[model samples]
Target: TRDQNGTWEMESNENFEGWMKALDIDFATRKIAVRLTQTLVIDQDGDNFKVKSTSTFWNYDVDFTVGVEFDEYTKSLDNRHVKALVTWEGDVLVCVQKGEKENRGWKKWIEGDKLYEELTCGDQVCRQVFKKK
Candidate 1:
């Protein structure tokens, strides 16, 4: 089971700026975003999940289920509305967000004690590695 129950701290980020730029996140926000350390707290109960992304600058909260689609409005991150759906591909949890942008979504997986996340926007994909803390 790909259990994601603990707190995970950011270890490193790759191509984050490129991905953020594609989302039109703005210069000021991306500059602050690139500097701060982001943490994710995920609480999973069966097929339901409450995931929160926290940093000194901003926070994003999402509540969703495994085989259901819902309307989600990203408040701080990009400020867009999307129809989001999550599915299980093996042990990995893959999400697809349908919105104005093409190929926008995120994926989460676990490898040992590390949590890996990949955020996609347009053609840019940002990889974020987080270690259990």
Candidate 2:
């Protein structure tokens, strides 16, 4: 198994603004968020995981375990509530968010020294690639 225990910085993002708009993020916040550099900190302990996404404008933190459901509140994002479930599909860490939005979730995987993340909502998908820093 690959150990994704390192700091990852965003290298590139595809359709990030479109996904943000789908999430109903405000124009000001979305504009700032798109320009800011983002970093993801991930901590893994067996089946437990803690993730923190940090940027210049906002931050989101989450803690969960594989196959466990938890409440999630978006702070700087859409400011909505959702039930989140995280699981491992092969080597990818897949998260399913159950809420008002349809097909809302995120998938993460580590490849070589890079981390790949895909955020989905409605019919929009945003792809973000990160490099180990």
Candidate 3:
């Protein structure tokens, strides 16, 4: 049983720039992106989910099921096409993106009324913390 629902507002982003650099995003875009906070809305039911991320400049949405691999085109985020798989590690939601980049994926979990993520790319990890809204 998990309770990772509702809209979570961004509290702080740690080393988001490093992760963006790992994605090979441009300097200008990285600077602007790090300055902007992101909000995440997650709706989960069984193994299915509708996840949404929003910022001032961009919005990314994804629908996926756990333990299932799907064609994930991240054009709005990283402009890469990948096969993504989501699974469960206890109460945590783990995702792996098999694409051009290595070590690409994210892990999501809830702790103390906040939602946390370790967004990964290459060797970089951006830990974005969010509070329930």
lDDT of 2 by residue, 12-128 (tens): 989989888899888887887887778999988888888999987777888898898989897667878999999888999889999999989999998889999999999999999
- Per-residue lDDT tens digits for candidate 3, residues 56-75, read 98888999988999997898
- Over 4 Å off, model 3: none
Candidate 1 deviant stretches above 4 angstroms: none
Q: Poorest 10 consecutive residues of model 1 by lDDT?
A: 1-10
Task: List lDDT for all candidates, in order.
Answer: 0.92, 0.88, 0.91
Cα deviation of 70, candidate 1, in Å: 0.3
Scored by lDDT, model 1 comes in at 0.92
Better of 1 and 2 by TM-score: 1
Which residue pairs show collisions in model 1? none
Candidate 2 runs further than 4 Å off: none
Q: After superposition on all CA atoms, what RMSD does each candidate show versus the true structure?
A: 0.9, 1.1, 1.0
> Candidate 3: TM-score?
0.96
For model 2, what is the error of residue 98's alpha carbon versus the real structure, in angstroms, after optimal superposition?
Answer: 0.4
